[PDB]
Paper text:
pmcPhotosystem I (PSI) is a plastocyanin:ferredoxin photooxidoreductase that is essential for the light reactions of oxygenic photosynthesis. This multi-subunit, pigment–protein complex uses light energy to transfer electrons across the thylakoid membrane. Each PSI monomer comprises a central core, where the electron transfer cofactors are found, surrounded by many antenna pigments, chlorophyll (Chl), and carotenoid molecules, which are involved in light absorption, energy transfer, and photoprotection. When cyanobacteria capable of FaRLiP are grown in far-red light (FRL), most of the core subunits of PSI are replaced with FRL-specific isoforms.
To provide further insight into structural and functional relationships of FRL-PSI, we used cryo-EM to solve the molecular structure of a third example from the marine, terrestrial, and FaRLiP-capable cyanobacterium, Synechococcus sp. PCC 7335 (Synechococcus 7335). The cryo-EM map, which is a distribution map of the electrostatic potential (ESP) of a molecule, exhibits a global resolution of 2.91 Å with local resolutions ranging from ∼2.8 to 3.2 Å. Each monomer of the trimeric FRL-PSI model built from this cryo-EM-generated ESP map contained the following subunits: PsaA2, PsaB2, PsaC, PsaD, PsaE, PsaF2, PsaI2, PsaJ2, PsaK, PsaL2, and PsaM. Each monomer of the trimeric Synechococcus 7335 FRL-PSI coordinates 92 Chls, two phylloquinones, three [4Fe-4S] clusters, 19 β-carotenes, seven diacyl lipids, one Cl− ion, one Ca2+ ion, and 13 n-dodecyl-β-D-maltosides (β-DM). Thus, if the core subunits are assumed to be present in ∼100% occupancy, we estimate that the occupancies for PsaF2 and PsaJ2 are ∼30% and for Fd is ∼10%. Based on the visual inspection of ESP corresponding to the C2 moieties, chemical environment features, sequence homology to other FRL-PSI structures, and cone scan analysis, we modeled Chl f molecules in six sites: A21, B19, B7, B30, B37, and B38. We found that the Chls in sites A21, B19, B7, and B37 all have non-His axial ligands and obvious H-bond donors to the C2 formyl moiety, supporting the assignment of Chl f at these sites. Thus, it appears that B19 binds Chl f with high specificity in Synechococcus 7335 and H. hongdechloris but not Fischerella 7521, which is probably linked to the presence or absence of the PsaX subunit. In addition, and surprisingly, Fd is bound at low occupancy to the stromal ridge of PSI formed by PsaC, PsaD, and PsaE, even though Fd was not added to the sample, suggesting that Fd-binding is less transient than in canonical models.
Author numbering:
A (entry chain C): 2 to 81
B (entry chain D): 2 to 144
C (entry chain A): 11 to 503, 527 to 782
D (entry chain F): 39 to 115, 121 to 167
E (entry chain L): 4 to 173
F (entry chain I): 3 to 44
G (entry chain K): 10 to 84
The structure:
């Protein structure tokens, strides 16, 4: 499975969550930014590694990083 | 156990294979107000029935591609789709929406599962976690 | 006004020229980085992205067509002017067997006038291989003033074509209902463009070309020949040549057509004098196809009840109305395809590019074997250049067909429109199509190329009895040999009693030699020809695999289920799912460009070597033919080593030993093509992040000198690096072959 | 020398004349240094010191002209002056670009030709 | 609208349109099924050894010929038939070693893919490793025997020829 | 002269059997052993 | 060498007329007949488009039949 890490430079714009094709990410309350939200990655067993969440992130540097890890049949995107 | 009519479809070569029945299958259910043509994520055009529809797909990404098509390519939008994971013993598990809202909104009760209170440029540099097993983000400090 | 279909806006403004990117909303933002500069020319003509109305796009396309026609007329004007001012056309008209065609002289600048070679007759110029002289001789030109007149007419037509494109967009542009009239368009193009065009050309041939060519073949000097209008004017002069013109246009209306059988002949061979086809036989061809195309133009219902409706014919081709074994296409059939083809310009462009490239390839294969112009077959450089050029144009056009079949999929395909029809049913079993194409490509790759590797190993072992040769294990193409035998039996004094000679001497028949050199002779098909035709089948099939795979999986696949949301030209979808690099349809057009190169290069190599060892040569007084390379295709072209030694190493003697001669530009361009091929590999093997990280250090060195620029320097994008690498590979690798072919054929004839 | 070279005359007295070998084989043979193959070899000696200065030193002027016109045009700028070359400011940076040799030594001593280490972006 | 509303020759596989196959005349006609389902791989009721035995007999028989006609020994009859025989022998032993190691690697616990207990593949009915070992033994026996039967018919081709021309009735 | 492979060296019957063993007799057993080693389950 | 082909005589006009009438007999069974334009159905069922199409196919059939019959002696 890949590791998706969310850092405190997150601004809760939700764009990483909206860009995820496999529903790894969701928003949780934070009170660490003024949106009141921060991304989280519980279903990271579903992560394929497309890094659409990283492309959608506006902060410099990214508040979300995907580290490609051990490949499973889900992270390899195999329908066979 | 899952309610819904299979969408009217002629079949394709892009559908379920062995791994669907030996590893895992996914199902997406949705209610449509009219009988109308959508695009299968497996290739082709199917027709959703008026009422409750249930479709088995091979990947969760296919079920989420269909769901994104339902809520964006149709007026009125179909936003009530539910995605389940089916196991070879028959066990069905409701996965999407994980909570019951929709990941893009914020629910009180979800909980942190990837948060690292840092700022990326301050992970522990790899010279110190060498023969440990941890790699640089699965840690706890900040250097 | 005459059809009430115009009233177009878009006033001719000048201010809209100093604001690049005005067509795209993000292109008119404000540059910022350098990617904008390259994005400006990446979708400049893509009128589909710019706006959303089909009618505005259709109007833009119509005026762009007019501007393109203007560009082609400017090119034609330039070619006729070059033949009328900087050519030895008159000298070649006098002696077209000892004079080399030339239509380009080089200015006396640095070392530069060495490229002006002696062309015979004291003319110092460059030997052209475009076949313009042989074409003008067949059309009826005798002096350069007529060429100058044609150049002026083409320039006037170009000005007229750029006025018709401005008047059909800025003054009175058509409505969308006019563009969607495919019945009327097909009727007019079939009857008025092709039918009347070939009828008018048949009139020209019967009254200008046939006279002039008959006197030329008789022996008359080019300026001793009457001008074409005298052939038109007095019927006594024209009746000296033909005795069927004494009865005028009377036998035609009274249906006594065998009266006309001396200028409408049906001989079907080659003129022994010139080497080209029988000119009377050509005129009869154009008369017959004019009658066929005009008659074909009355097929589609337009405003008068009679005719077909293509929508009805499309919607009825379906089960259970089909042939029983063709009934697998289901009960919808071709129902939604008339609305696909009348609302998508990309669908039409895909079909038309496929047919245009295929027809250009057919043109290439029909003009070496049935040489249609005087003294064409004996100028081997021209024959080589024409075949090679039309094969390359055909291959590029065919690749663009797949490109636009993929653009139709991502953009113009609507699942709700076409449900359970042939287009839906193809997308609904494309794994079967692609897997069977994968297997046939593998079968053909083992049974063509690995047989060549077998032959290499057997020849290096010293056991040529074990080879796939004509002296080892024979692989005779019995079906093509049988077709060749049927073609030479048909034309007997049979199944075609009207023709005297075979349709080409390539099938069989005799030998036509003109000026000592061979115009045409039978092309024997042995084991080497079996092997190279299966090479051709294999390469065409892998090109089809690469291109069709991108077309069929342009929407989605099992890997990326929402590929149509990503676009038609996108680099990847990240390093996940193992790494989805080059999954777009555009990347399949990228990879099929290489495969079209590899396919057409072997076709032009097969043609060059086979024609040079088994057709072209030098007939002596007795009749013995000494071929150029000496009939070494049947034993050297069956191994890879013989292709590298007896074709590439041996026949590149004339291009590398050309320094200091008049062919030295060919040696320079040979090396230049090698450079551009190798330089392409920098873009093809490397990736974008290296170059962006090296530009970081270069930007640091620039910031330190305070030479910072506002437009921020960025590396070429991923698909742009791919496009640049592909363009460079194709350009260098084709310039190399061009220089090799042309230096070889301009030195040994 | 090329005038007394025994192998340099077999390309003298057997070659096309034209206007590329007749008014070029002379001045060349008078003032070049050929070896044994009858070919002028570009030497680097004390006699070449006042010979190689006109390729080397006079190229340095035009190269610095281009580099200083590209500098003085681009300090006075802002992402539309690179697209649409402002001909007035281009002429202003050409007129100053003519005598760029002096201006270049009037920047190093003043410290306005180089940027500070903390005023230029770097990478990790 | 039209998506499985009209009745066409091409149906979903097993009536399930979400399966990755179609019911075409080549996998679903009565002639195609009558031929394929009665081939030894699929004939109902047979033990794996007899399936393998008939597969091997048919296979070792035709595998002799390509080297008899095309091999390095083809200039002489006796050596050509021997080269074809040992080519069939080597291909048989390699293929059966592959069958044995496929069964050894696949059937480890609950297998993965089509030989998992939950698999619905109708086209792969040898679900047990015992079936695969009986198949390997049968294919080996039958293929080596069919190869030497083709070899013996090619060695005695002069006799089989005089027999089938009635030259033995003098 | 050379109608077949020869050895003008000591124990020249050893290539005759060593080349089959190293190159087409023992390799497929070695491939099977390595395949069974890489596909064995925990 | 060439397929005979006669000039024009009462025998040629008969074949060209009998073939124009067969065209009329079979051209009554077309669809979208009497399609206005000019003389909307004033040609015994057919309009002017349908009459011109029927006579054009009749001329085509006549030229083909006449040249065939002239080739083989009958005409
Ligand atoms: C496809 C279009 C095309 C191309 C590739 C050329 C190419 C060329 N032209 Mg041409 N030309 C063209 C169209 C074209 N022309 C048209 C439409 C006209 C007007 C009818 C001309 C009239 C023209 C003249 C008068 C001359 C050229 C000349 C030339 C040569 C050098 C031009 C130059 O140095 O600048 C060059 C090979 C020059 C040349 O050939 O030098 C001897 C020259 O004298 N051209
Ligand atoms: C018999 C009448 C007629 C003729 C001769 C043409 C001819 C042409 N049409 Mg047109 N068209 C017609 C009727 C006709 N059309 C009708 C009724 C419609 C409405 C359904 C259209 C709708 C149409 C469209 C949408 C387009 C064309 C285009 C073209 C050009 C095709 C370019 C080419 O293939 O070779 C080029 C050959 C050229 C020979 C020489 C130029 C000839 C000039 C233009 C006319 C010749 C006059 C002649 C004496 C009559 C071509 C010149 C395409 C085009 O290129 O746009 C400009 C295109 O976009 N046509
Ligand atoms: C379609 C283009 C075309 C054009 C513009 C012409 C034009 C002409 N033809 Mg004609 N011709 C054509 C096609 C054409 N032809 C074809 C397809 C045939 C084969 C049947 C002929 C066979 C023909 C004959 C036998 C004669 C003409 C003649 C003529 C000239 C006047 C005689 C006449 O009209 O009656 C005239 C300049 C007459 C002529 O020779 O005048 C110079 C003449 O008697 N033509
Ligand atoms: C009738 C012929 C025809 C027409 C009208 C088009 C039209 C179009 N093509 Mg297309 N295509 C064609 C043939 C044609 N093509 C052929 C023969 C090929 C195979 C090489 C392609 C492959 C192709 C691809 C892969 C793409 C297009 C695209 C496009 C669209 C935008 C073109 C553009 O960006 O500006 C003009 C672009 C240039 C002028 C680039 C020129 C640089 C070239 C490579 C160097 C040439 C070297 C020189 C000859 C030596 C446009 C609608 C693009 C698109 O996005 O469609 C929506 C797109 O991605 N085409
Ligand atoms: C010479 C270089 C080379 C070779 C051998 C290949 C070979 C192949 N290409 Mg490829 N390609 C190449 C260059 C090459 N390519 C380059 C330079 C590009 C740049 C754009 C591409 C891009 C490309 C694409 C996009 C595709 C291919 C495809 C294929 C496969 C075609 C199917 C086939 O022919 O089956 C036969 C196999 C061969 C001809 C390989 C050589 C076999 C030798 C002769 C026999 C070996 C004997 C024996 C087995 C050896 C065993 C010894 C043991 C010790 C291992 C094939 C394996 C297509 C494919 O996948 O088809 C299904 C595919 O779509 N190629
Ligand atoms: C199977 C392919 C085949 C093809 C492509 C042709 C093609 C042709 N035949 Mg032909 N023919 C064939 C089989 C074929 N034939 C057979 C099996 C017979 C019976 C033996 C004939 C007997 C025949 C006769 C008698 C004539 C032709 C003629 C012709 C030519 C006129 C075109 C036309 O008929 O309209 C044409 C090139 C005519 C011709 O020779 O042109 C003058 C003609 O006179 N054919
Ligand atoms: C007028 C603007 C301008 C000026 C004053 C400079 C000046 C300089 N550049 Mg530069 N550069 C420019 C534009 C300019 N560049 C452009 C348009 C490009 C893209 C082609 C580059 C890409 C570039 C690279 C990759 C490098 C430089 C480097 C350098 C430095 C020394 C080497 C050199 O000049 O040759 C190099 C010049 C080129 C490669 C092209 C410039 C030619 C244009 C037309 C002027 C020097 C201070 C080198 C450096 O970093 O110094 C340590 C170096 O490695 N440049
Ligand atoms: C009246 C009956 C009749 C007869 C006896 C013939 C006889 C003949 N026709 Mg004909 N034909 C006919 C009606 C007839 N046709 C009709 C109604 C048409 C439609 C317009 C045609 C259109 C036609 C064409 C296009 C050709 C013939 C040809 C031929 C000759 C070739 C023999 C063959 O292969 O068959 C032959 C003598 C061929 C031929 O040899 O031309 C001389 C050929 O080219 N025919
Ligand atoms: C599909 C099909 C087909 C084909 C078929 C085929 C492919 C064939 C074949 C065939 C074959 C391929 C056959 C075979 C066979 C065999 C046999 C007949 C065998 C045998 C054997 C034996 C008898 C052996 C014996 C032995 C043993 C075992 C032991 C010891 C030794 C010996 C020798 C004694 C066709 C189209 C035609 C039609 C129908 C269907
Ligand atoms: C070399 C290379 C680059 C670098 C290439 C670049 C940046 C383009 C080079 C074009 C130069 C920079 C020309 C631009 C210069 C200005 C236009 C000035 C030119 C001067 C004229 C006006 C006279 C990539 O970006 C790249 C990306 C992906 C795969 C492979 C590669 C790759 O191989
Ligand atoms: S890499 Fe792709 S699948 Fe994984 S969290 Fe990011 S967007 Fe989702
Ligand atoms: S896209 Fe980036 S900033 Fe926005 S919610 Fe996701 S991690 Fe936070
Ligand atoms: S290597 Fe390049 S093309 Fe491939 S996945 Fe990574 S970014 Fe995309
Ligand atoms: Ca042998
Ligand atoms: Cl060889």
């Amino acid at each position: 499975s890949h590791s998706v890490k969310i850092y405190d430079t997150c601004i809760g714009c939700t764009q990483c969550v909206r860009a995820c094709p496999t529903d790894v990410l969701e928003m949780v309350p934070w009170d660490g930014c003024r949106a009141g939200q921060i991304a989280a990655s519980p279903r990271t067993e579903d992560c394929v590694g497309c890094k659409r969440c990283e492309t959608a992130c506006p902060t410099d540097f990214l508040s979300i990083r995907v580290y490609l890890g051990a490949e499973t049949s889900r992270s390899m995107g195999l329908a066979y | 156990a899952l309610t819904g009519s299979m969408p009217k479809f002629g079949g394709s070569t892009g559908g379920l294979l062995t791994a669907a029945f030996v590893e895992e299958r996914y199902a997406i259910t949705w209610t449509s107000s009219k009988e109308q043509v959508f695009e299968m994520p497996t290739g082709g055009a199917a027709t959703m029935n008026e009422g409750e529809n249930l479709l088995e797909l091979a990947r969760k990404e296919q079920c989420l591609a269909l769901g994104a098509q339902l809520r964006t390519k149709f007026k009125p939008k179909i936003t009530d789709y539910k995605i389940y994971r089916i196991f070879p013993n028959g066990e069905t598990t409701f996965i999407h929406p994980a909570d019951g809202v929709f990941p893009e909104k914020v629910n009180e009760g979800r909980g942190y599962s990837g948060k690292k209170d840092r700022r990326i440029g301050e992970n522990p540099n790899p010279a110190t976690i060498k023969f440990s097993g941890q790699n640089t983000f699965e840690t706890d400090m900040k250097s | 006004a005459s059809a009430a279909t115009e009233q177009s806006p878009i006033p001719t403004s000048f201010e809209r020229w100093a604001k690049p990117g005005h067509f795209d909303r993000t292109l008119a933002r404000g540059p910022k980085t350098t990617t904008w500069i390259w994005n400006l020319h990446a979708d400049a003509h893509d009128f589909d992205s710019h706006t959303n109305d089909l009618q505005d796009i259709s109007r833009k396309i119509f005026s762009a067509h007019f501007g393109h026609l203007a560009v082609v007329f400017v090119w034609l004007s330039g070619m006729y002017f070059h033949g009328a001012r900087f050519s030895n056309f008159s000298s070649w008209m006098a002696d077209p067997t000892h004079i080399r065609p030339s239509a380009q002289v080089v200015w006396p600048l640095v070392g530069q006038d060495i490229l002006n070679g002696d062309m015979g007759g004291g003319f110092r110029g460059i030997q052209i291989t475009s076949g313009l002289f042989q074409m003008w001789r067949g059309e009826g030109f005798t002096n350069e003033f007529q060429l100058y007149c044609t150049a002026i007419g083409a320039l006037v037509m170009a000005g007229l074509m750029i006025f018709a494109g401005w008047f059909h967009y800025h003054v009175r542009s058509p409505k969308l209902e006019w563009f969607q009239n495919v019945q009327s368009m097909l009727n007019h193009h079939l009857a008025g463009l092709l039918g009347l065009g070939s009828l008018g050309w048949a009139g020209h041939l019967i009254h200008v070309a046939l006279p002039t060519n008959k006197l030329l073949d008789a022996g008359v000097a080019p300026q001793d020949i009457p001008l074409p209008h005298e052939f038109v004017l007095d019927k006594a002069l024209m009746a000296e040549l033909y005795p069927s013109f004494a009865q005028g246009i009377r036998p035609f209306f009274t249906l006594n057509w065998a009266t006309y059988s001396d200028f409408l002949t049906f001989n079907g061979g080659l003129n022994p004098v010139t080497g080209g086809l029988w000119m009377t036989d050509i005129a009869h061809h154009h008369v017959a196809i004019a009658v066929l195309f005009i008659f074909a133009g009355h097929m589609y219902r337009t405003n008068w009840g009679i005719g077909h409706s293509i929508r009805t014919m499309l919607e009825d081709a379906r089960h259970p109305k089909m042939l029983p074994f063709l009934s697998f296409i289901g009960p919808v059939g071709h129902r939604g395809l008339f609305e696909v083809l009348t609302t998508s310009w990309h669908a039409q462009l895909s079909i038309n590019l496929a047919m245009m490239g295929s027809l250009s390839i057919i043109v290439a294969q029909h003009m070496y074997s049935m040489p249609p112009y005087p003294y064409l077959a004996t100028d081997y450089g021209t024959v080589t250049s024409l075949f090679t050029h039309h094969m390359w144009i055909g291959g590029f056009l065919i690749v663009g067909a797949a490109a636009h079949a993929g653009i139709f999929m991502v953009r113009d395909y609507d699942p709700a429109e076409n449900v359970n029809n042939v287009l839906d049913r193809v997308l609904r079993h494309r794994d079967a199509i692609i897997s069977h194409l994968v297997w046939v490509c593998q079968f053909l790759g083992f049974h063509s190329f690995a047989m060549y590797c077998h032959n290499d190993t057997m020849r290096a072992f010293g056991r040529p009895q074990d080879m796939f040769s004509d002296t080892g294990i024979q692989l005779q193409p019995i079906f093509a040999q049988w077709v060749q035998h049927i073609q030479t039996m048909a034309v007997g004094s049979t199944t075609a009693p009207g023709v005297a000679s075979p349709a080409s001497y390539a099938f069989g028949g005799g030998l036509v030699a003109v000026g000592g050199k061979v115009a045409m002779m039978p092309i024997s098909l042995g084991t080497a020809d079996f092997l190279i035709h299966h090479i051709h089948a294999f390469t065409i099939h892998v090109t089809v695999l690469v291109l069709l795979k991108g077309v069929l999986f342009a929407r989605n696949s099992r890997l990326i289920p929402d590929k149509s949301e990503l676009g038609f030209r996108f680099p990847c979808d990240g390093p996940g799912r193992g790494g989805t690099c080059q999954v777009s349809a555009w990347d399949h057009v990228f990879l099929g460009l290489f495969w079209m190169y590899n396919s057409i290069a072997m076709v032009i190599f097969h043609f060059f070597w086979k024609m040079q060892s088994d057709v072209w040569g030098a007939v002596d007084a007795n009749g013995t033919v000494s071929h150029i390379t000496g009939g070494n295709f049947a034993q050297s072209s069956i191994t890879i080593n013989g292709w590298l030694r007896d074709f590439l190493w041996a026949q590149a003697t004339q291009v590398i030993s050309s320094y200091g001669s008049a062919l030295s530009a060919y040696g320079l361009m040979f090396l230049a093509g090698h450079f551009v091929f190798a330089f392409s590999l920098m873009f093809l093997f490397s990736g974008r992040g290296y170059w962006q990280e090296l530009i970081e250090s270069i930007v640091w060195a620039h910031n330190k000198l305070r030479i910072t620029t506002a437009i921020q320097p960025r590396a070429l994008s991923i698909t742009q690096g791919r496009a640049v690498g592909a363009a460079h590979y194709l350009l260098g690798s084709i310039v190399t072959t061009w220089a090799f072919f042309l230096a070889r054929m301009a030195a040994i004839g | 020398p090329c005038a007394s070279s025994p192998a340099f005359n077999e390309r003298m007295q057997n070659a096309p004349e034209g206007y590329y070998f007749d008014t070029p084989y002379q001045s060349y043979a008078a003032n070049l240094l050929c070896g044994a193959e009858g070919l002028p070899h570009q030497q680097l000696r004390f006699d070449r010191a006042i010979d190689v200065l006109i390729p080397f030193g006079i190229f340095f002027y035009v190269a610095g002209f281009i580099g200083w016109s590209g500098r003085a045009y681009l300090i006075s700028s802002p992402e539309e002056t690179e697209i649409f070359i402002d001909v007035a400011l281009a002429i202003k940076s050409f007129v100053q670009g003519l005598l760029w040799p002096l201006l270049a030594v009037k920047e190093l001593t003043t410290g306005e030709l180089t940027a500070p280490v903390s005023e230029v972006s770097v990478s990790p | 609208s039209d998506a499985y509303i009209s009745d066409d020759p091409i149906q979903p596989y097993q009536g399930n349109p979400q399966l990755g196959n179609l019911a075409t005349p080549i996998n679903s006609s009565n002639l195609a099924k009558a031929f394929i389902n009665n081939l030894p791989a699929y004939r109902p009721g047979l033990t794996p050894f007899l399936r393998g035995l008939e597969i091997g007999m048919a296979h070792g028989y035709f595998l002799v010929g390509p080297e008899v006609v095309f091999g390095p020994l083809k200039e002489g009859s006796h050596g050509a038939n021997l080269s074809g025989l040992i080519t069939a022998i080597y291909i048989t032993v390699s293929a059966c070693l592959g069958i044995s190691i496929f069964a050894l690697a696949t059937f480890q616990g609950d297998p993965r893919g089509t030989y998992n207990s939950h698999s619905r593949d109708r086209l792969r009915p040898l679900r047990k490793k015992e079936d695969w070992y009986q198949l390997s033994g049968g294919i080996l026996m039958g293929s080596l025997g069919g190869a030497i039967f083709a070899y013996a018919l090619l060695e005695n081709f002069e006799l089989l020829d005089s027999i089938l021309r009635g030259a033995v009735n003098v | 002269d050379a109608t077949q492979l020869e050895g003008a060296y000591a124990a020249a019957w050893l290539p005759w059997i060593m080349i089959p063993m190293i190159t087409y007799i023992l390799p497929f057993p070695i491939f099977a052993i390595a395949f069974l080693w890489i596909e064995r389950e925990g | 060498v060439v397929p005979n082909t006669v000039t024009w005589g009462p025998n040629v006009a008969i074949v060209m007329i009998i073939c124009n009438l067969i065209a009329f007999a079979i051209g009554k069974q077309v669809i979208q007949i009497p399609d206005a334009g000019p003389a909307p159905g004033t040609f015994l069922g057919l309009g002017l488009p349908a009459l011109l199409g029927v006579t054009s196919l009749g001329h085509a059939i006549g030229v083909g039949a006449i040249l065939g019959l002239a080739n083989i002696g009958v005409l």
